[PDB]
Amino acid sequence: SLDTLAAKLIEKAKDLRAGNSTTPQQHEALVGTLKQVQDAVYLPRDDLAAMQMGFVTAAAIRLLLHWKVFEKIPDTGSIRYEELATQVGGDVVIITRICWLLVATGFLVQEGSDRVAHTARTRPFAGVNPLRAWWLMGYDEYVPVLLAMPRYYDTYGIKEPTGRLHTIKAFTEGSPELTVGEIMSRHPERTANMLISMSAMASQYPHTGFYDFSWVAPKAAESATRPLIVDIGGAKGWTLQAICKETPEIPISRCVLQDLSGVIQMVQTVGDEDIRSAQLMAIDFHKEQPVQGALVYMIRRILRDFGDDECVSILQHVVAAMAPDSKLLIADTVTGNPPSWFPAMLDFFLSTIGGKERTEEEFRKITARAGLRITGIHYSDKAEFAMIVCEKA
Amino acid sequence: SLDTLAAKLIEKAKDLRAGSTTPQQHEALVGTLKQVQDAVYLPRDDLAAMQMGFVTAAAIRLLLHWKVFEKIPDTGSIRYEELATQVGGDVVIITRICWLLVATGFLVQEGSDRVAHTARTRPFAGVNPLRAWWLMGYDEYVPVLLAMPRYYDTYGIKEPTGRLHTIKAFTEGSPELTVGEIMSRHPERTANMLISMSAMASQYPHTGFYDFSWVAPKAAESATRPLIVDIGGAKGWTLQAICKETPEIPISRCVLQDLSGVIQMVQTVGDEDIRSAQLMAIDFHKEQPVQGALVYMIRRILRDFGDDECVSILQHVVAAMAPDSKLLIADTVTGNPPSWFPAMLDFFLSTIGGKERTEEEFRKITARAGLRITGIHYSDKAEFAMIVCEKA
Numbered sequence: 033s034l035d036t037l038a039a040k041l042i043e044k045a046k047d048l049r050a051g052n053s054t055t056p057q058q059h060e061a062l063v064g065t066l067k068q069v070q071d072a073v074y075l076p077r078d079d080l081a082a083m084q085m086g087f088v089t090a091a092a093i094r095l096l097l098h099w100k101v102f103e104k105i106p107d108t109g110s111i112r113y114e115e116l117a118t119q120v121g122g123d124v125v126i127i128t129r130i131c132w133l134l135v136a137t138g139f140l141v142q143e144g145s146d147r148v149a150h151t152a153r154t155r156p157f158a159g160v161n162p163l164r165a166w167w168l169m170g171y172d173e174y175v176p177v178l179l180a181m182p183r184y185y186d187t188y189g190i191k192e193p194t195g196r197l198h199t200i201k202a203f204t205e206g207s208p209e210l211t212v213g214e215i216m217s218r219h220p221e222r223t224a225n226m227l228i229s230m231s232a233m234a235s236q237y238p239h240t241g242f243y244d245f246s247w248v249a250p251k252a253a254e255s256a257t258r259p260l261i262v263d264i265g266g267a268k269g270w271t272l273q274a275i276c277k278e279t280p281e282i283p284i285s286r287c288v289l290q291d292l293s294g295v296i297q298m299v300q301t302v303g304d305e306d307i308r309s310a311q312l313m314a315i316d317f318h319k320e321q322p323v324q325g326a327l328v329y330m331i332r333r334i335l336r337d338f339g340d341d342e343c344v345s346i347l348q349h350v351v352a353a354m355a356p357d358s359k360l361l362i363a364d365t366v367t368g369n370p371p372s373w374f375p376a377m378l379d380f381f382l383s384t385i386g387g388k389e390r391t392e393e394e395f396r397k398i399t400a401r402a403g404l405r406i407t408g409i410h411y412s413d414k415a416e417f418a419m420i421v422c423e424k425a
Numbered sequence: 426s427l428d429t430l431a432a433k434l435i436e437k438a439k440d441l442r443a444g445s446t447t448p449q450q451h452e453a454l455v456g457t458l459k460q461v462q463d464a465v466y467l468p469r470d471d472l473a474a475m476q477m478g479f480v481t482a483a484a485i486r487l488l489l490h491w492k493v494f495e496k497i498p499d500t501g502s503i504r505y506e507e508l509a510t511q512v513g514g515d516v517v518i519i520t521r522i523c524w525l526l527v528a529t530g531f532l533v534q535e536g537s538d539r540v541a542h543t544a545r546t547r548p549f550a551g552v553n554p555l556r557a558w559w560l561m562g563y564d565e566y567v568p569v570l571l572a573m574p575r576y577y578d579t580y581g582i583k584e585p586t587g588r589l590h591t592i593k594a595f596t597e598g599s600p601e602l603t604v605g606e607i608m609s610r611h612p613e614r615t616a617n618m619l620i621s622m623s624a625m626a627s628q629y630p631h632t633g634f635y636d637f638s639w640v641a642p643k644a645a646e647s648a649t650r651p652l653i654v655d656i657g658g659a660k661g662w663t664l665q666a667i668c669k670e671t672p673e674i675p676i677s678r679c680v681l682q683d684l685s686g687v688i689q690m691v692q693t694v695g696d697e698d699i700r701s702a703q704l705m706a707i708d709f710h711k712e713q714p715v716q717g718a719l720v721y722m723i724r725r726i727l728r729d730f731g732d733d734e735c736v737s738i739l740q741h742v743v744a745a746m747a748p749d750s751k752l753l754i755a756d757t758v759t760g761n762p763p764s765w766f767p768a769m770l771d772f773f774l775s776t777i778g779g780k781e782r783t784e785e786e787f788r789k790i791t792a793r794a795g796l797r798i799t800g801i802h803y804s805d806k807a808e809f810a811m812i813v814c815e816k817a
């Protein structure tokens with residue numbers, strides 16, 4: 033209500049005078065209560081106007097980034113508009129009008145009528161960092177594709193995009209006959225910025241803590257030879273390291289990391305003690321799975337990137353290598369019907385590259401098509417992220 | 426302050442509990458909540474809200490384009506499978522797009538397989554001003570916003586003040602045209618534009634702030650003198666509103682002037698009332714062909730152009746005025762820095778060479794035009810005013 037929102041502002045205001053640090057959960061509770069009050073108070077005209085304002089605040093921020101203006105505003109204190117325009121080489125009038133939009137939305141602050149200053153909301157834009165990179169990637173790489181969607185579906189029909197080719201991203205870029213990865217290989221700077229961002233937001237999903245891997249330990253003791261955990265597309269090998277430190281009875285010596293040759297070379301050179309002690313193979317999981325009869329094959333946050341047929345083909349390669357008692361673990365979102373907002377928004381983005389978040393029923397369909405049977409689903413506490421346990425059917 | 430904002434919410438909550446609340450009170454409550462948002466949001470909240478806004482916008486645009494909102498009933502619900510069959514599309518992608526709006530509170534899902542409107546999506550289920558206003562921003566401005574960086578790299582970091590080579594014309598690919606001309610050349614974009622001019626009365630009221638009844642007397646001094654010339658009047662909504670408030674002003678004595686393509690469209694879209702006015706194609710950059718009218722009204726025109734172009738537009742009208750003629754500017758008037766809603770539009774308007782102005786900025790322009798301001802009548806519900814002028 034309006035009253036509980038005021039109560040949380042009073043608590044915040046108090047904790048700030050006392051120098052106590054707000055907690056993350058406290059911050060979300062306050063943002064949540066605000067959104068509930070706005071939902072209750074805003075009329076449709078208010079929602080639509082706020083949506084339009086979001087467009088121009090984003091465009092203002094994009095233009096000031098392009099002009100390198102956030103770098104020139106000091107961390108603290110104020111800079112004169114005239115001084116800012118001189119350092120940019122631009123007309124003070126248009127630079128002032130753009131800042132005025134951000135002043136009226138509380139992104140910037142004016143200290144007189146001629147000086148402007150940062151807030152906590154704009155300091156991330158004043159230098160290189162993962163959040164700025166993520167912001168720019170989503171704006172430059174995603175918003176144009178969002179605008180092209182009606183045109184895209186006019187062209188291909190109102191159909192779920194499921195291929196790796198003729199994606200909406202590639203269609204927007206003008207090369208529908210290339211994959212997104214081939215497009216990005218033609219674009220070093222955009223790929224560089226994407227690494228910084230794609231790496232940061234991976235750490236928002238948990239690797240362990242909601243699924244017990246320790247049942248692998250008995251087999252590690254009955255047999256000296258059987259490979260234990262094969263991580264398919266596991267990147268730097270951090271998942272395997274965590275699993276084996278959570279359960280030291282699982283020798284990382286007997287686990288396998290599979291990725292692309294360029295990523296396996298980085299694991300060997302500047303990788304740490306134990307990941308380097310594990311078998312590292314450069315593979316293409318679209319076409320092959322060399323390790324035969326391992327106890328566990330793991331596919332974490334990968335199937336979301338592909339359509340059903342591509343997932344079934346990936347799964348069928350793994351099933352061909354599985355022994356009768358092998359498990360195939362899929363770590364991914366099992367979205368609800370209907371889905372919560374974060375997975376719903378990820379699913380929307382994924383439609384630009386041919387992927388999707390899948391419901392439980394959709395996961396049963398693709399696993400059944402691969403000759404698998406889901407025996408369990410173990411949920412994390414984070415946005416329906418689960419461990420899906422499968423066996424040969 | 427957080428503590429002063431809390432006090433605002435507490436007193437507005439008391440007001441609601443005691444019962445109605447006026448438009449000003451709504452606006453003020455929304456305004457306070459936006460102050461709360463500013464005071465409370467951190468970068469990751471700003472990022473999330475940015476992404477959500479673009480994704481929701483895109484999902485709305487697709488469902489509009491596919492005619493989905495029109496097929497969801499005003500009340501009740503409809504199965505995804507019925508929706509899909511009726512639009513001739515794949516049930517899975519349509520479900521996925523609706524699910525996004527279900528998750529963000531725009532649509533509601535019933536059971537496992539049915540979808541329903543909320544008050545947030547009924548505006549998109551048919552033709553109305555609010556929807557037209559939203560479509561104007563999304564179809565006619567958002568792609569242009571994405572062109573601003575390249576545009577300023579093409580022409581320099583300078584305020585865009587010309588009526589040609591606007592960011593909009595730059596994006597449109599028509600360097601030889603004004604924005605008004607670009608709009609006037611496609612029937613659907615023109616029809617949407619006209620309908621949007623009825624929207625956002627809370628910002629751009631058509632009546633309630635200026636009294637026209639002084640005209641009714643003079644209406645008797647002549648059977649043919651034009652009473653109100655509506656310069657760039659779109660489809661005459663403001664003329665119809667004025668002539669309802671003051672029934673002594675006959676609409677037949679008023680002139681609706683706009684671009685050739687716009688005024689022709691008024692012939693098919695307008696009702697018998699406005700079609701009984703004097704419709705007239707003009708180009709107000711070059712001319713005011715009706716000399717000696719009683720009132721020249723310039724409503725939400727100057728906002729669309731830079732200072733020099735405004736002065737030049739005004740000078741053509743001054744030339745046409747009789748000594749007893751009045752020139753009326755109806756438009757937004759904000760402070761500095763601009764308020765929330767005018768600040769949004771000032772940024773939008775830079776793509777077409779215009780801007781939001783203070784009262785002082787308008788006085789400078791009317792002065793350069795050879796006009797004297799005899800009065801400024803502000804609305805008590807919106808930063809909007811009628812500036813009454815005569816020849817100096």
Ligand SMILES: C[S@@+](CC[C@H](N)C(=O)[O-])C[C@H]1O[C@@H](n2cnc3c(N)ncnc32)[C@H](O)[C@@H]1O
Nearest residue numbers: 265266267290291292295315316317318332333
């Ligand atoms: C979404 S990323 C990260 C997935 C990882 N399991 C995790 O927990 O984050 C998917 C990984 O798959 C790898 N990959 C992409 N294509 C591959 C292929 N054809 N064969 C093997 N690995 C591939 C990439 O190098 C990337 O590290």
Ligand SMILES: C[S@@+](CC[C@H](N)C(=O)[O-])C[C@H]1O[C@@H](n2cnc3c(N)ncnc32)[C@H](O)[C@@H]1O
Nearest residue numbers: 605622657658659683684707708709710724725
């Ligand atoms: C912001 S709209 C205002 C419409 C209407 N006066 C109102 O306030 O609702 C600007 C109007 O000016 C018209 N316009 C633009 N350039 C024009 C020109 N050169 N000559 C005549 N009308 C023009 C547009 O077609 C549009 O109808």
